[PDB]
Design a protein around this nucleic acid. Sequence first.
DNA 1: CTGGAGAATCCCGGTGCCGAGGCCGCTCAATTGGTCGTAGACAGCTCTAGCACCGCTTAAACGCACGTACGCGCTGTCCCCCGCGTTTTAACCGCCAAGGGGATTACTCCCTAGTCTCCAGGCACGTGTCACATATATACATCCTGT
Lengths: 187, 116, 81, 80, 96, 95
Amino acid sequence: GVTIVKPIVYGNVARYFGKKREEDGHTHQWTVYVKPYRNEDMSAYVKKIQFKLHESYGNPLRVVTKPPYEITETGWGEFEIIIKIFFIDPNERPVTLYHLLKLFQSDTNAMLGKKTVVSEFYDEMIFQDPTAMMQQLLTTSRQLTLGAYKHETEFAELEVKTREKLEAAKKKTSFEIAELKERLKAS
Amino acid sequence: RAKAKSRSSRAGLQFPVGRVHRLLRKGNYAERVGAGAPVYLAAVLEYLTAEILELAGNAARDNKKTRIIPRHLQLAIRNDEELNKLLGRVTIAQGGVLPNIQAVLLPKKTESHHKA
Amino acid sequence: LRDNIQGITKPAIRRLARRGGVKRISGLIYEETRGVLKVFLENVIRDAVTYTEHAKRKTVTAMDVVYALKRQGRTLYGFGG
Amino acid sequence: RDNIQGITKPAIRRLARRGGVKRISGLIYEETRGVLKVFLENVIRDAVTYTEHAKRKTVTAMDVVYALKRQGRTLYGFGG
Amino acid sequence: KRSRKESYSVYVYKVLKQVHPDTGISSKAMGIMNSFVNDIFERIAGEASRLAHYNKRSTITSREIQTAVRLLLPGELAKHAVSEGTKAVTKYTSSK
Amino acid sequence: YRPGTVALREIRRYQKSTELLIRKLPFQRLVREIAQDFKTDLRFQSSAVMALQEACEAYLVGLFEDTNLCAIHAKRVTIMPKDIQLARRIRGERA
DNA sequence: CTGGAGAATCCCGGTGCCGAGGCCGCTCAATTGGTCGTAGACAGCTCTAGCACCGCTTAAACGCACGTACGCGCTGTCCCCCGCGTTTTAACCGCCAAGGGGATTACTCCCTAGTCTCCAGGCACGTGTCACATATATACATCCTGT
């Protein structure tokens, strides 16, 4: 009768090189990742997360161990990445996630000239009737970082949300300086 | 009282026999240090320092420098057969290993006349 | 943290090998070098923090690192004062 | 005297067999003899120094134990 | 309220100048030389202490230090240090 | 050129000079991350970090020398992982 | 790939030899009880680094492209270690004198060394300059332009 929910967020960010590789054939540097929504260390209950990429790569099955869980790799096309989350408790069934590697922008986002592509989805790992050890591990998770934790799902809108404040404050300071100090010098 | 004479001057050593004996008596190395132990220790320290300084100055003069630097100390320690045996485990900050000569590149391969 | 062991890039390991007389370096040598340097730093910093905590101090002094290296047989001159 | 040949070919062969070796080169014996001679010379020099310091005429086993301890070869079974 | 720390820079620069009048030494080279001095000090002291302890002796004497110098310094380096120490002891007891 | 030139000149140069081959800033973050696992909110004196870097560089130079020797042992000029592995095993670090 | 031998192990039970264990009897060394200066611990106080940034500059790390050079496998064949049987020899004895060579114990004794003073001079610290590095007038010095 014990149910513990661990919210997570998985996805990938991609950056366009601006030109296709000379002889390789890659166009975007992308980083698939799995990270928690709440500021907590997932490794307290996660043993390893495997990322099975396309067979075209030398090693399709990547692995990570610690709270980040990101592999940086370059590619040329979009494909489905199978993410399998293994827990410390071997009696707990691993969780399998399916994420579509997104590298290209939509026409609307392309017209905006934004360089970074982002696609991560909100998810929750439901542990129904977990073992005593797994329950303790889930309940004893510590905080990961001292700062805040954020997500840029789409980014198209988060960039505008950030700019509306950043550029506003920057322009206000620039004006307060230029309009006032020149007249102060005039006096 | 009579003009006090230090123990470094009596024996004829530059390093401090007094400070040596001081570190020894309250260093817990023994219960009652002998009067001659510190003299001998300071003498050996002085001899080793003089030797390494001679070698470092020789290396500096060979390198056309006036101020001794970790480079010279490392070179001197690794060139001498016995000092390297004594200081094999030691590492020195801002030091370096003995280098190799690049003259071997010239009579094997260099840039050709192609678009020179 | 943000995978700081990767802060030792290929040029640095290549320079270290050059100084060590190495003539040519393989591709996988860099991972082995980062893993060996990591293991060495682990022991050194463990000894240093053991000397520090015992002193009830919040700062890892240079003398702590010197004593740690001296325990490993890696006596280091230059920071004795 | 020159009795360093007391460490004969079969002795070195057995010492190597104990070390996992199954095939030894011909020139291995004259090198092993020199290595063992140097190791001895060193340990025996240390032991003789320890003995002369004690004003004793006999090189006790504990002196050999200390000499080995100096070289890092701590030998248990003889006193320390 | 001063927190003074000691060093051998005073006896090493003197030794340097007496053996190399024209050649100086940098501050970091001086620190390295002081570290070497302290390391050899510790080595000789520990060796003499252990040697005295082996003979059930509670006092480190000049003989213990002499044998420790014989043991530590390798090949044709010990002899010179032993001779210097003996000549300094003989000139020290002679009240000169 | 090819495998035979600039490596030798780089050897000569980096052996003549004695500057720190590893960058200070990236190595400091590595040291702090390694220390994190022992004591939270730990401070390090600059000289301590410099000494750590010097010791690490010296150890790595010695390891690469022993590894260059292992590579030459097998009639090879390139140092492979098994070379470093053998150097460490005979050293007694990972026997 | 089995047979078919054929040695090598290796169960497995047996049997005295002698080290392992135990018990006894003192000796000595850890405990007890109590006094007595330190050790260091802890409560402040100071101010030195340590950390944390931020900006500008650019070396440098880095990815890519592109051969060449070195790595690995293959092959041939040809020396030099292995396996094993014979002659050699050194390593065990045993012998036959008659006594010491040297660690070990012990007792005076006595120089040497701790302890504990008071001092004063010699070595950490503050300050005075001088060798090398830095940034800027300058007297021409090379294109550009009236002419």
